[PDB]
Amino acid sequence: MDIDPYKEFGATVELLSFLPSDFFPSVRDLLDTAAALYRDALESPEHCSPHHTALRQAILCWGDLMTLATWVGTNLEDPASRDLVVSYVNTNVGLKFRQLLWFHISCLTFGRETVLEYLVSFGVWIRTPPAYRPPNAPILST
Amino acid sequence: MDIDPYKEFGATVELLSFLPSDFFPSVRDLLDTAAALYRDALESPEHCSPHHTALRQAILCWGDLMTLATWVGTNLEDPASRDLVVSYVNTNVGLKFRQLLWFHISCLTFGRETVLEYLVSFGVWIRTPPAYRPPNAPILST
Amino acid sequence: MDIDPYKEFGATVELLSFLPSDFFPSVRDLLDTAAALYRDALESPEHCSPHHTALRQAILCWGDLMTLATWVGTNLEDPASRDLVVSYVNTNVGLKFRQLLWFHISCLTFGRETVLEYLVSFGVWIRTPPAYRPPNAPILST
Amino acid sequence: MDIDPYKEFGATVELLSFLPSDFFPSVRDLLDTAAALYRDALESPEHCSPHHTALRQAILCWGDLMTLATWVGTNLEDPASRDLVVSYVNTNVGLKFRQLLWFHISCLTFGRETVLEYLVSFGVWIRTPPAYRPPNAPILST
Amino acid sequence: MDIDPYKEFGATVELLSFLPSDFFPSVRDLLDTAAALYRDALESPEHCSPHHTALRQAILCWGDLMTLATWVGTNLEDPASRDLVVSYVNTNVGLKFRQLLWFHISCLTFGRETVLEYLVSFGVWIRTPPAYRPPNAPILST
Amino acid sequence: MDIDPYKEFGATVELLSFLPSDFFPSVRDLLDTAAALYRDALESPEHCSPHHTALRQAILCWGDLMTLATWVGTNLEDPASRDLVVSYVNTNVGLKFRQLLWFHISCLTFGRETVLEYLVSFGVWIRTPPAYRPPNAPILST
Structure with missing residues (x-):
């Protein structure tokens, strides 16, 4: 059976795959x-x-x-x-x-509804090929 | 049947070709x-x-x-x-x-109007010849 | 993932292979x-x-x-x-x-309640042995 | 640091050493x-x-x-x-x-306060010398 | 002991024997x-x-x-x-x-008090010898 | 289709595999x-x-x-x-x-909720190794 370690916390393992x-x-x-x-x-x-x-x-x-x-x-x-x-x-x-x-650690310091609104805004940055994306990565802060 | 799969939503097949x-x-x-x-x-x-x-x-x-x-x-x-x-x-x-x-997959996450106003605000970025472009292309974030 | 393209509409892909x-x-x-x-x-x-x-x-x-x-x-x-x-x-x-x-193409000319009764009423009509059933096949009515 | 694996859940790792x-x-x-x-x-x-x-x-x-x-x-x-x-x-x-x-598993089915009742009532069984120890070892019941 | 698989549902096994x-x-x-x-x-x-x-x-x-x-x-x-x-x-x-x-299947689709009022009207058709009965068998419908 | 023989009645066929x-x-x-x-x-x-x-x-x-x-x-x-x-x-x-x-039979005499209590309380008996397993296996009582 699947367990999906992040499934109860809003995220999944496919969403956390985009982080290099x-x-x-x-x-x-x-x-x-x-x-x-x-x-x-x-x-x-x-x-x-x-x-x-x-x-x-x-x-x-x-x-x-x-x-x-x-x-x-x-x-x-x-x-x-x-x-x-x-x-x-x-x-x-x-x-x-x-x-x-x-x-x-990032959900205890910054909340749950911020890291789940950060992995989306990082999931749209990393899929964009390097010729068409900002050089500054989105930083995690409140 | 000159059927356009985007015409129901606001964009066209000719507006989405601004993106390379x-x-x-x-x-x-x-x-x-x-x-x-x-x-x-x-x-x-x-x-x-x-x-x-x-x-x-x-x-x-x-x-x-x-x-x-x-x-x-x-x-x-x-x-x-x-x-x-x-x-x-x-x-x-x-x-x-x-x-x-x-x-x-980027319209359910960011609304309809934001993506439909993203393709115009990307359209004034890629046409400008490579001298006078900003270093950061616009990307849509939450 | 397992998507049947009919699960919204009430039918499945099993109920439409139930017709020949x-x-x-x-x-x-x-x-x-x-x-x-x-x-x-x-x-x-x-x-x-x-x-x-x-x-x-x-x-x-x-x-x-x-x-x-x-x-x-x-x-x-x-x-x-x-x-x-x-x-x-x-x-x-x-x-x-x-x-x-x-x-x-045969639902929005007859409604959704009519076809989902037609897929059963014709679907059980064919399996009946030859002369114990109404002698013509049913068809849709506007 | 010294994370005790059970300290949030009643027992400790010293209490669970009664079980062989x-x-x-x-x-x-x-x-x-x-x-x-x-x-x-x-x-x-x-x-x-x-x-x-x-x-x-x-x-x-x-x-x-x-x-x-x-x-x-x-x-x-x-x-x-x-x-x-x-x-x-x-x-x-x-x-x-x-x-x-x-x-x-045993806390999840039988409750927390029955396993913590069970770990004590097994500890007053394993130490009794075998001349006066009952052969019916304690087991759980819902 | 007898069980009579249909006995609780109104019918018996002698009534269902007339179906050829x-x-x-x-x-x-x-x-x-x-x-x-x-x-x-x-x-x-x-x-x-x-x-x-x-x-x-x-x-x-x-x-x-x-x-x-x-x-x-x-x-x-x-x-x-x-x-x-x-x-x-x-x-x-x-x-x-x-x-x-x-x-x-016929009692879930058509009710119980219709199949029990169909096996009677088929039990009077099949006992009649072929020279004196209608050629159209009674059909099951609501 | 996958008809589970017991799914309407509490247990499943995976739960009833505890009994040898x-x-x-x-x-x-x-x-x-x-x-x-x-x-x-x-x-x-x-x-x-x-x-x-x-x-x-x-x-x-x-x-x-x-x-x-x-x-x-x-x-x-x-x-x-x-x-x-x-x-x-x-x-x-x-x-x-x-x-x-x-x-x-055992649900019909002892109720449903006692057999579903019994199938668990037999599963915490068959797995205990024989050095610490009581010889009194659990049986039913009204």
Whole structure:
């Protein structure tokens, strides 16, 4: 069955596909943004608005792959086998969690009805071929 | 029957040709926008706007020529025959459906008057010879 | 995505294969029907009913897909391959536009309540064994 | 930071250590229960309760680690060093997703306050020495 | 014990015996009539009037004998043994389900108090010997 | 079409797969319970509840497949090819009528909402590994 991780939040996964793979910051940049201005709300025993429930279930999922990124780096005899698994987590699977950590940080800081009105105005900018588009990308702010 | 598929909406086939042939983004990109934020409306047994009824008949018309592109690549032995039909559907016909899907996937998102006033305010940008043009072409945002 | 082009109108694509494949009159005999009764309402700048908008996107889809049957009569010098495309347009794809045009050109001359009772009352009339049924087939009344 | 996976939902990871490493059913058998009872809940665009939102991120992280258990099978060369990664996803990581899927199925059907009643009433069963321990271990009932 | 499949619906099995074995259409004709104009009501999780409960328990029973009509056609070594079982299902057992599928289609389309006032007026026509009866059989309509 | 046999009555065929293929009693033993308690119900011309109407079509399809298990015994010649049809009615088809008669006996006596409580509370018994599974399997009580 499909799940579509963004389906309850207004967006889908086809709408988040238009963001190119350098619009997201690195993974240690996104975890430290949640480790700076939401640590009072994430660890609290009351759950806030349903981004906070989806966000603390997404950091721990990346927190488990950091164990798999370390256990592979120790308990494999081949240095050629060790390089493919560690690079696969930080390139392909990591790019999925660069989307998922970004969307729940940007909806807690700027609201839900602004990022959903930003991915439309970015979805009309990136489809336009480079000869006919403004050179300044639309920036995210309130 | 000099039937114009835009005359019911305000634009013509002659007004939409201000945009050049390579401005329209590719066919897989637009069908990943109709399946991004209109999947709930196109499936439902109720036409919301007359743009939905033209758009619902526009994907299935492309759904036939995609079926004919698959069929012409399996039940023909001759590769010189096979490489001309597929290069005709995706290039010489597929410029008409990129014009038609763009006028219904960017009009439900931004209204009718804004797109109909976008093609005039793009028309005074592309005619100006390449010396005295602004660096930013107009694009429609929310 | 799974779009049947009739789900708005009450019928499905299953209820229109419930009539036999021989009942539907020929394709060139319905474009000569639309262009005789309802010709000044298709080219009108206003859309009267949502049957008109679905019909105007259904002629031009056939007006395009017939041009692909003409284009392969000049740029395909192979009678082993030229006949198979035209016998695919006129037979396999041509069965769907022979009944998509019939559900719109024979609805707005009789209403929508009359045809959706006719597709059942003739649809159950054929399966009846020969002489236990009213001896003539029903037809539409204005 | 120290995100406790259950702190919003009553229990903690210290309380859930009463259950041994053999009480949990296998991951290939809960997902035939998270899809048999509940399919209309975790497809719909509305979240009913925060057990539904925490279940989707818990069912898609297994959706990534099943892809990684397949990707290693077709790209990693050494068959003796390929088994050691596949037997890490099913054994050591999967014991945390046997744990996380079980808590959001048994709370989702039996309520939250019955599982928190159950985790205590299993903890006064596993510690009793076997000379005086009843063979009827406690299980759930709606 | 007797069950008399029609006993709760006003009729009996002696009253339905007078219909000769060509008044019923073929089995693929009766299933497609229920697959045309009642598919919205049969698969719905609410049960309608008690014909709908008896009808969807009668299609599945025929849906299981189509498995027995296929499994016999594969896993028997004798082509003489294979012919008797396949013909017995389509002649003798099939004639029972041509009655049962017809009576619940004709009561949903025309009411219960019309088919029960039709089998009487057919039960007086078929008993009359052919020299003294009208040549036109009584037809079923509202 | 896809008629789900239980969709009107709460459960589905995916939910009823929790019960293994050995939990159901034999067909020759439920019909001595569908005739011991209930004889005045399923003879009478009034249907009390839709469990009664769905039981008669479920008790007469076995009434046809018992006739087919007798008809093959007296007409089919090969005694090695006769056992293979008789051991298909009792084994593979009968496992669906052990299934269908059980759900309309246990719901008919214990109510609908107790069996749907029972199918869940058996599903949290069959999956628990045998080191921690109680020997008292759940059974019904009025």
